[PDB]
Every structure is written in structure tokens, then in C-alpha cells.
Design a protein around this nucleic acid. Structure first.
Lengths: 38, 238, 384, 148, 89, 51, 121
RNA sequence: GCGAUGAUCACCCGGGUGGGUACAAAUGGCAGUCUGACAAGU
RNA sequence: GAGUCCCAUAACCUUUGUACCCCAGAGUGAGAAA
């Protein structure tokens, strides 16, 4: 990713467990296929 | 597919009084007017509501031609809450019960049947639904049962007869409101098996029009049925 | 040329007078059709002159039969005579063409109209309904139409409360619920009275018997030879419990409970007794109805078993419709019909399906076919 | 609610497997005039062209455009009212026919259209399974009817 | 209810991304948003459908995701996919 | 339940007095409902167990 | 009025007993009361045939209820005894069902007989 | 002296394991019984 | 200071006892006996 020089980064204007571990992975698991599938 | 433990999310359909149950499969369902029982052995959903156990019935599109129309994606369905509906050709409660569910307790369903044998089960269904009024009488003679039907907003006719247009008209003139709903189911083989389906449907939409019904829509019911359609129309007396 | 209009209401007959006649040439014009919808315009066309309510439910149906067959009832003859002038010929609007000749026969001086113009006025009356009756007591039409519905439609089919089989489904549902309740309350009675006299609980295992003994033996201290004979009469002395309870009651372990406590035990035990008494009455009830409702099915397998089969299918009409294989699995969860054993179970299932068909589709089913259809099963049983 | 009209079940792609003898033919206003010009009068002129029995239909509109034509086109009116010519009544406000004629074949894939107006021809060419019949030369010609 | 259960939220997420759950199942393209009003209901069998379409009591779970947990094929199917994607990433 | 004990059949409802059971406004509703009722006639064999 | 209604006349029975016969040859025919019910349950029955002299008749009056629910024609022949040979089978048949097949060699006279049966109904 | 009004068609060594349905009991499991000096008025 | 308002008056799981079931299941559909 981008590595902006610090001098540029200074001169910016302002605007710019257990069972669940198995059931929380499987959610972030399924979401990845659907994104890759689409 | 839809097996006993499987859990589903009930969310409303575009048409008022119609609901969708999501999951691995999507089901068309209507809330049960008489919870705790099935009318033709259909499938049911029970939801815990604050807690009261509200109950919802599965609408099988193959069995019900109207439900196939919803699957077909009808733009307008006059059958809606707080509306009077005249059901012609009511063989039994297979579809009328679902129509009874859509109209709700404020509404009523005027079910018309001819053959006595299906009528007995329809009457048995009619008791369980206080809103259904069974009329075991020939639809070809609306004067026979004018005594029993008040003024109705919409007419549903699934009569599989060659003279259905005459039956629809006479009932529409006697019972249907001005600007009221007309929704018909047509099978080509009974009316005319000699000629293709498409010419038949053209002929039927023609007959509705002399009778002062403005037809709005038509839907063939594939993949659920061959050689059907549902035509939706408005009755323009004036 | 219309003057009077005859309209039928489920509550009664109302005849109307046509004050103004709508334009006949321009009947199909937009504006005139709107006037039918508009109540204010319509009231100028017609006015209510009479209404004759039906005396009761019976009159509405027999008139409902008569209206349909194009016939004139005594009520129709009565109302019309007082209204239509004898008079060239007075003109009456009727929705039915078939009713016209009947009216003409009774009344030669009236000429009937059922043209679209007459239909137009009749449609408007139905549209507004009781709003045109201007306050006259018509109750409310909607339930009367609904009430006349199972009066009219359901008459033509010739059912009977004889046909009704819900008596069997609710009886079996109530019977099993009673069976659970009698056991639940009875077992409580053992606990309440167990504190006071526990070993009497083991002496009389039969729950129904124990409640009766507790009713007589409220206090274990009270022990007399005459009382021993009294409780000896209860059940029999073959088990010897009559002598045991006296010997036990003399040297016992149960802690005395208060008078109010004992009052609940016998009163609660009395409640248990009543439910069992009602349960046997309902059991005998279930037997009688099935012989009346399903003599073939009841005779083949039995009353209690058949009532359960009807409930599983949901109705006798249901049970008749399924194929034989479905009927066999309908009672495969409680072994109602139960390698060689399985053959008999299916064989009986085939015949049970037939008995439902005979019972369901016969207005007055008999047991002649059920009696024989059991006999072949007996021949079937002997060969295997 | 979005509406996406279904393609007619009478179509295997752009073949209409429903139109079979006898046919239904709609008549356009210009067609009667050109038929009179080439002296190919209506019913048999088809019968030679198609070798099948057809049912000519004149809409309330088309009977109306024929009648706006005036005294110069009287012959078209009497031919238009032949009893063998059935009538297709219309329930739309406008008397404009070219939108009237095409819109029916949009619904039901069971008609042929009779026309010589270039205004109306290509509209039928995009829509699939609508045979298109016209009068040219000395007799009628059918373009998108493979059964011929 | 406001502050909805994590269990209900995960069930909704499953329906939204229903396409990815099975390889041989495909669905119409839909932008499904959480409905403003909804309930959670259970499917009840007719007695005649005991063999055909009734799952065992042990298999039944209160929330959809646990039933997906019991299915071994879905777990095996997916463990392969998650490994394959991470290799590309 | 106490109503069913006083009136066994809707025909009895028209004349049976429900004052001790129901207030004046409610008791007339059941009477009016009885004549415009919907249910079918039941046998005395049936009526006995309902009581 | 009669429970066995409508009953095919002498002629109409012959054409029905004809279409029954080729169907047995072409494996389009399910015969017996329960098979008729099963073909009805799956909705593969284009029309059913039943016998009016069934002993007793009541054991086949379930089928009219099933068909009229779903709009399948049905018709009665005077003889269950006659309906046997048309099935090609060595015992009497009280009820039989011809099934739906648009891929059958014998479609044309089926729709001819199926045309007549509704006219009778 | 037949039949469509229906013929035909899980493991181990008679026993033990394994599984399904319905009811009843558990003071068996989830499962762990909230905080603690200020509040109110002229 | 602080959720009665998602039955701790309860749901589910485990153990135990009682009574049935291990034939297919929208079960199949012409053989069986000699």
C-alpha cells in the first residue's frame, strides 16, 4: 500500500469462546466465498 | 429441503397478506386463520410472538394456480386485507383457505362449488374459517344464490369449463363492483383442444371485453403448469 | 314503465316503489351508471315502501329453496298482495326471469320485468343494502347471508350429524387428557396422604383404589372392627390389605396432618374420583358413536383403536382417501395394526382402508360388510 | 415494482410454434387500398399465398382509419365489412392503429399482420415470431412464416 | 427488538450470503436487506411425512447456523475452499 | 361453561334467563347470536357429555 | 342421483375398453383401486376408469373425490368383469388409471376418449 | 381347491450391543443469585 | 443506581424407569403354488 512522505502528511488540508469461535469463523468464512464467487 | 429442525425467516411479500419464508429455499406462506392444523396436509411455520405462538401455512404453487401466479409475479392482486372476494369453482379448501388467509377476519370468501362430493369437505373447511361462505351451487345460474352473496369487490374463477366467460360475466354483472377486480384462470384444452393455447387466450381476452371487463394482465404459469394463464382485469361498468 | 321492484333480503322481502324511471336509451352512458353508485341520486329513483322479515331461520331456508326454484312462497304471496294494486297491468321488477311465470299465475294483474333496466335498479339496491332501508330493523345482512349459507348450501348435500366424525376425534383427545390428569392428581393424593400414613400407599398400589380408601380412612388412628369390615368390603380381603392396614395403622410412621390438611386430601381425592367417573362415561360414549359413525372400522379392529386412526388421518374423510400403504404407516408409531407378523399387519391395513371407504361414503353405514371383512382376516390369520 | 415481461411460451427462440392453420390475420388500413390497387381481393388472395384457411380481423381502429379516408376510398369500406371478416374490438382511448396493431402481437403470439405501410413493418421485424404479410407485385407475400 | 441477539444477526447474515453455502446450489441475484418487521419460525411436519421430510430431534437446533454445523459435508466442502483462497491471498 | 348448563340448545337460549351469569347488555347478545347462530343441531346423546 | 355417475353408454365403453387395451401393451396402465390412488396422488393420471358393478360400490368412491379436487376426468363402465380383459389380466379390475404421457404411441385416441369423457361429465 | 377387492420383495457371540418414538423422575448440566451511603428541602 | 414485560412458574442436553418399534415409505407392483 501507499507510503506517503511525512512532509506531505504534515501539509494536508483536513478533509482528505469455544462454540462461538467455531460459529464466528464460519461466518467470516462464508462471506469470503460469496465475495469471491460474485 | 424444508425439514423439521430447519429454521426460517419470515418477511413480508409485496402483496399485502402474503409472506416469504427464507432459508436454504424460499417459500410462499400465509398466516394461518386456524392455528394448529393443516387443510390439505400442507406445510406450516410456527413463530413465537410476544409469548403467543402464531402459525403460518405453506402455499404450494403447484396445487394453487393463484400461488403459481404470485410465483409468476403478478403486478396487481385484488385479493387483499379487508376485501370481499367471490371464489368460483372452489373444489375444496386447497386454495380457498389460502385466499381466506389473505383477506383476513375482516374479509370474507364466497366459495362457489357445483359437485356435491367436493362440497362436503369444503363445508367442513368452512366451519373452521368463520369468514368463508360455501355456496354449493352451479355458477352458471347466479340467480340461484343471489340470496346468499352480498356486494363483492373481486371475483376469482378457476372453473374449468368451456363456457367460463359466460359464467364470469353473469357473476360479474350481478356481484362485482364497478372498477372491481376480475382474476381468471384459463386452461386451453377444456375450452378448445383443437387449436393452440395462444389463440385460445386471445379468444378469451376478447370475450371478457364485450362483457365490460378491462383486462390488465396475463401470466402463463410455467414451469408449474402447461397451457395455463392468469388474466387480471378490472370491471368497467360505466 | 317500471313502478314496483321486488328485492329479496336474507332477513325478509322488501318491495320498492320507483319514483323516477331512469333513461332507457342512455342506460349505458357514463353519467347514469354513476348515479347507480351514488346513494343520493339513487334515492330519487326509488323508495322503500315495505319490508317483511322472516319469522325465523326455518322460513328463510324454505323461502331460499322456493326463490331458487322460481317458486312463490306463502310469504311472497302475502307481501305482494297487500302492495301491488289490482289495477293497465301493474309492472313489477324481479331479478329472476324464472320467477316471473310463478308471479303471473298467482297474480294475473301484474306484469314482470327482468330486463337490464330492472337489473340496474336491483344492482343498486344490493350495493347500498340497509342504507336504503332508512333505519328499518334488518339486523345486519352480512351474517344473515352467512347464516343462510350453511342453511342453504349445506341442505342440498344431505350430510347428517350422523356423518359428523369430530365426535370421535375430540372424544379420544379428551379421553387421553383425562387419563393423564387422573394419574397426575391421583399420584399427588399419594404424596399428601403419604405424609400422614405412607405405608398405605404401598399397600394399595392401584391408584383409583387408594383414593377411595383414603376417603374412608381419613385418620389412621380411627381403627375399629366394624371399620375393618367396611374397608374389607372395599376391594377384597384376598390380598389381605384389610388386615394389614389395621395392623399398620396401629403401629405407623406417618405424621398427623391438620384437619384442614385432611380436608384437602379427601376433597382432592374426590376430584380424582369424579374425573375417572367422567372418563368411563366418555369411554362408553366413544364406543357408541363409532358403531354409529364407523360400524365397519370399529367392528374390524375395535373402537378405541379405530378412533385413534381417525384422529391420525385428521378425519374419516381423510382416512378413506389415502392409499393402503399410507394407512399402514398411519398407525405404525403406536403399533395400532400390530416377517410373518408384518404380513398380517399389512393385510389388516388393506381391509381397514376399505372399511373407512364404506363408512365414509355411506349415509347410514352398516356392519354387514365389516363383519365379513373381519372374517377373511380370521381366515388369513389361521393360515399363517 | 419492476416489470420484465415474460417471453411467450409459444416461442422456441424466434420460431412461433403456435401459429398453425387456420391462421389469424390482422388487416391494416393501407392493405385494403393496395389490395384494390393490385386487384388482389382479400380472402382467396391469401388462400393462394398461404395454402391455408385464415381468419381476417379488422380492429375498431382499422375500420375507423378506413372510414376517415372518405368518399374516394368507399370500396375499401365495403370490402372491410365483409361478413367473413371478423372484428377485433378495442379498449384504448387513441384511434391510432399502428400502435394498436403491434401491441396485440406483443401480448399474444398467434397473429399475422397484413400491411404495406413501411411505418409499421420494421416494428414487427424486431418482435420475434410475428409473421409479416404484405401485398407486392401481383399477389400477397409472407416474409416470416417458415411454414410455406 | 433493539439490541438484537447475535444469534438472529448471524442467521440473517446466512440468508444474505446464501449463494456461497453449497457448490451445486445457485440463486437469483438479489439485494436482500434486513426486513423492517420479521419473525423466526420453525417448520412442522405432517405425521405422514415422518420418514420423508422429518429430521431427528438431536439434529434440530434453535438457530440455523448450528444445523449447518452438524452437516459434515458442508464443513468438509468449505475447509478446502478456505485453504485454497488463503493460498492465493 | 355455566351458560351451557343453563341452556343446552340455542332454542333454549331465546327464553333462558342469563341474569345471574351475565350482565344485561351481554346476556342479550348471546340471545340475538343464538337465532342468527351458525352451529348445527346436536343430539341429546351429545348434549349430555357437554353438560 | 346414483352414486355411480356418469355411466358410459354401451358404445362409449367400447372405445374406453379399447384405449385400456393398448395401454396395457404399452406400459401406460396402472390398474387396481390403490394404484389409481397413487397415480392420482402424484398427479400423473390423465383419466381413471372404474367399474359400476363393484361389490360393494363404496370401496371405490374415494377416487371421484380425489379427481374432482384436481380436475381429472373419470367414467364408469357397467362391468368390473369386462374391465379385466381390457387390462390384459387374469382377474377382475374395479378401477384402473391411464397415466399422462405426451411421449406415448397411443396419445391420439386417448385425447379422443379424454375429449368424450368431459362431455359426459 | 390363490392373487390388483393386491402375489412378491444396523453390529457381534438363542443372547448381548446399537438406534427411533411417547410418558414420568433427578437438590443432574447449562447455572453464576444485582450495587452499597447517600437522597430530599430552605 | 438498576431488562417483570425472550414463561428460572421455563427452554434445551445428560442419566434413569415404563411401553412399543428395527419390512421398504408419497414403499414397490404380478406373480404365487405346483
Amino acid at each position: 500500500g501507499l507510503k506517503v512522505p511525512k512532509a506531505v502528511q504534515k501539509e494536508l488540508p483536513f478533509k482528505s469462546g469455544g462454540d462461538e469461535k467455531k460459529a464466528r469463523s464460519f461466518i467470516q468464512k462464508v462471506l469470503t466465498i460469496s465475495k469471491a464467487k460474485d | 429441503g424444508a425439514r423439521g429442525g430447519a429454521k426460517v425467516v419470515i418477511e413480508p411479500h409485496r402483496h399485502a397478506g402474503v409472506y416469504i419464508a427464507r432459508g436454504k429455499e424460499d417459500l410462499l406462506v400465509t398466516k394461518n386463520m386456524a392455528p394448529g392444523e393443516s387443510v390439505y396436509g400442507e406445510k406450516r411455520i410456527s413463530v413465537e410472538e410476544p409469548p403467543t405462538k402464531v402459525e403460518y401455512r405453506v402455499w404450494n404453487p403447484f396445487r394453487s394456480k393463484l400461488a403459481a401466479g404470485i410465483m409468476g409475479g403478478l403486478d396487481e392482486l385484488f385479493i387483499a386485507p379487508g376485501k370481499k372476494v367471490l371464489y368460483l369453482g372452489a373444489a375444496s379448501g386447497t386454495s380457498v383457505s389460502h385466499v381466506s388467509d389473505v383477506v383476513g377476519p375482516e374479509g370474507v370468501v364466497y366459495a362457489v362449488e357445483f359437485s356435491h362430493r367436493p362440497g362436503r369437505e369444503l363445508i367442513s373447511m368452512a366451519k373452521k374459517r368463520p369468514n368463508i361462505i360455501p355456496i354449493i351451487e352451479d355458477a352458471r345460474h347466479p340467480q340461484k344464490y343471489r340470496m346468499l352473496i352480498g356486494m363483492v369487490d373481486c371475483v376469482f374463477a378457476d372453473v374449468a369449463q368451456p363456457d367460463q366467460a359466460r359464467i364470469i360475466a353473469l357473476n360479474s354483472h350481478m356481484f362485482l363492483k364497478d372498477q372491481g377486480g376480475v382474476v381468471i384462470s384459463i386452461k386451453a384444452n377444456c375450452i378448445d383442444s383443437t387449436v393452440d393455447a395462444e389463440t385460445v387466450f386471445a379468444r378469451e381476452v376478447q370475450k371478457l371485453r364485450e362483457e365490460r371487463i378491462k383486462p390488465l394482465e396475463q401470466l402463463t404459469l410455467e414451469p408449474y403448469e402447461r397451457d395455463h394463464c392468469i388474466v387480471v382485469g378490472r370491471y368497467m361498468r360505466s | 314503465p317500471i313502478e314496483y321492484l321486488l328485492f329479496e333480503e336474507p332477513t325478509g322481502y322488501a318491495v320498492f316503489k320507483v319514483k323516477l324511471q331512469q333513461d332507457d336509451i342512455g342506460s349505458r352512458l357514463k353519467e347514469v351508471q354513476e348515479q347507480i353508485n351514488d346513494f343520493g341520486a339513487f334515492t330519487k329513483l326509488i323508495e322503500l315502501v315495505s319490508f317483511a322479515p322472516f319469522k325465523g331461520a326455518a322460513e328463510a331456508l324454505e323461502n331460499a329453496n322456493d326463490i331458487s326454484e322460481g317458486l312463490v312462497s306463502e310469504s311472497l304471496k302475502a307481501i305482494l298482495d297487500l302492495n301491488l294494486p289490482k289495477a293497465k297491468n301493474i309492472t313489477l321488477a324481479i331479478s329472476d326471469k324464472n320467477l316471473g311465470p310463478s308471479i303471473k299465475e298467482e297474480f294475473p294483474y301484474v306484469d314482470c320485468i327482468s330486463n337490464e333496466l330492472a337489473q340496474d335498479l336491483i344492482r343498486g339496491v344490493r350495493l347500498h343494502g340497509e342504507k336504503l332501508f332508512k333505519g328499518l330493523q334488518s339486523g345486519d345482512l352480512e351474517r344473515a347471508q352467512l347464516g343462510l349459507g350453511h342453511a342453504y348450501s349445506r341442505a342440498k348435500v344431505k350430510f347428517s350429524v350422523q356423518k359428523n366424525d369430530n365426535h370421535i376425534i375430540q372424544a379420544i383427545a379428551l379421553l387421553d387428557q383425562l387419563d393423564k390428569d387422573i394419574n397426575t392428581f391421583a399420584m399427588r393424593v399419594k404424596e399428601w396422604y403419604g405424609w400422614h400414613f405412607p405405608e398405605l400407599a404401598k399397600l394399595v398400589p392401584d391408584n383409583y383404589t387408594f383414593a377411595k380408601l383414603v376417603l374412608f380412612i381419613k385418620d389412621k388412628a380411627s381403627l375399629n372392627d366394624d371399620s375393618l369390615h367396611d374397608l374389607a368390603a372395599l376391594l377384597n380381603e384376598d390380598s389381605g390389605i384389610a388386615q394389614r392396614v389395621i395392623d399398620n395403622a396401629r403401629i405407623s410412621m406417618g405424621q398427623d396432618i391438620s384437619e384442614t390438611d385432611m380436608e384437602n386430601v379427601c376433597v382432592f381425592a374426590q376430584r380424582v374420583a369424579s374425573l375417572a367417573d367422567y372418563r368411563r362415561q366418555l369411554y362408553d360414549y366413544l364406543c357408541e358413536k363409532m358403531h354409529t359413525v364407523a360400524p365397519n372400522l370399529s367392528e374390524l379392529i375395535g373402537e378405541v383403536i379405530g378412533a385413534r386412526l381417525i384422529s391420525h388421518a385428521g378425519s374419516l374423510t381423510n382416512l378413506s382417501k389415502q392409499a393402503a400403504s399410507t394407512v399402514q404407516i398411519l398407525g405404525a408409531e403406536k403399533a395400532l395394526f400390530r416377517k410373518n407378523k408384518g404380513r398380517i399387519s399389512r393385510y389388516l391395513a388393506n381391509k381397514c382402508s376399505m372399511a373407512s371407504r364404506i363408512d365414509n361414503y355411506s349415509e347410514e353405514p352398516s356392519n354387514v360388510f365389516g363383519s365379513v371383512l373381519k372374517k377373511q382376516v380370521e381366515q388369513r390369520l389361521e393360515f399363517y | 415494482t419492476r416489470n420484465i415481461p415474460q417471453v411467450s411460451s409459444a416461442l422456441f427462440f424466434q420460431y412461433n410454434q403456435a401459429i398453425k392453420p387456420p391462421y389469424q390475420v390482422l388487416i391494416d388500413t393501407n392493405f385494403i387500398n393496395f389490395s384494390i390497387q393490385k386487384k388482389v381481393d382479400i380472402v382467396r388472395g391469401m388462400m393462394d399465398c398461404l395454402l391455408a384457411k385464415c381468419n381476417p380481423l379488422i380492429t375498431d381502429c382499422v375500420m375507423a382509419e378506413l372510414e376517415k379516408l372518405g368518399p374516394k376510398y368507399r370500396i375499401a369500406l365495403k370490402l372491410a365489412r365483409d361478413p367473413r371478416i371478423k372484428r377485433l374490438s378495442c379498449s384504448h382511448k387513441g384511434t391510432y392503429a399502428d400502435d394498436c396493431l403491434v401491441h396485440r402481437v406483443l401480448q399474444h403470439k398467434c397473429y399475422i399482420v397484413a400491411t404495406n405501410d413501411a411505418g409499421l413493418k420494421q416494428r414487427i421485424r424486431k418482435i420475434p415470431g410475428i409473421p409479416l404479410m404484405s401485398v407486392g407485385g401481383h399477389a400477397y407475400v409472407i416474409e416470416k412464416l417458415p411454414d410455406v | 427488538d433493539d439490541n438484537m441477539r447475535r444469534e438472529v444477526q448471524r442467521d440473517l447474515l446466512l440468508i444474505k450470503h446464501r449463494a456461497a453455502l453449497d457448490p451445486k446450489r445457485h440463486y437469483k441475484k438479489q439485494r436482500w436487506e434486513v426486513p423492517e418487521r420479521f419473525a423466526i419460525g420453525t417448520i412442522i411436519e405432517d405425521k405422514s411425512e415422518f420418514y420423508s421430510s422429518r429430521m431427528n430431534r438431536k439434529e434440530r437446533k434453535s438457530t440455523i447456523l448450528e444445523t449447518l454445523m452438524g452437516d459434515e459435508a458442508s464443513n468438509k466442502y468449505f475447509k478446502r475452499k478456505y485453504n485454497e483462497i488463503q493460498e492465493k491471498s | 361453561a355455566r351458560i351451557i348448563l343453563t341452556m343446552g340448545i340455542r332454542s333454549k337460549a331465546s327464553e333462558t334467563d342469563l341474569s345471574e351469569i351475565l350482565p344485561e347488555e351481554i346476556e342479550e347478545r348471546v340471545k340475538t347470536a343464538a337465532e342468527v347462530s351458525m352451529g348445527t343441531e346436536i343430539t341429546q346423546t351429545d348434549l349430555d357429555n357437554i353438560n | 342421483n346414483p352414486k355411480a355417475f356418469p355411466l358410459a353408454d354401451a358404445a362409449l365403453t367400447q372405445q374406453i375398453l379399447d384405449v385400456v387395451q393398448q395401454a396395457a401393451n404399452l406400459r401406460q396402465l396402472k390398474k387396481g383401486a390403490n394404484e389409481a390412488t397413487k397415480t392420482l396422488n402424484r398427479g400423473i393420471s390423465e383419466f381413471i376408469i372404474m367399474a359400476a358393478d363393484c361389490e360393494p360400490i363404496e370401496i371405490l368412491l374415494h377416487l371421484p373425490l380425489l379427481c374432482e379436487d384436481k380436475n381429472v376426468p373419470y367414467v364408469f363402465v357397467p362391468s368390473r368383469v369386462a374391465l379385466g380383459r381390457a387390462c390384459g389380466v387374469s382377474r377382475p379390475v374395479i378401477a384402473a388409471s391411464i397415466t399422462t404421457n405426451d411421449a406415448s404411441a397411443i396419445k391420439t385416441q386417448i385425447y379422443a376418449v379424454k375429449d368424450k369423457i368431459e362431455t359426459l361429465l
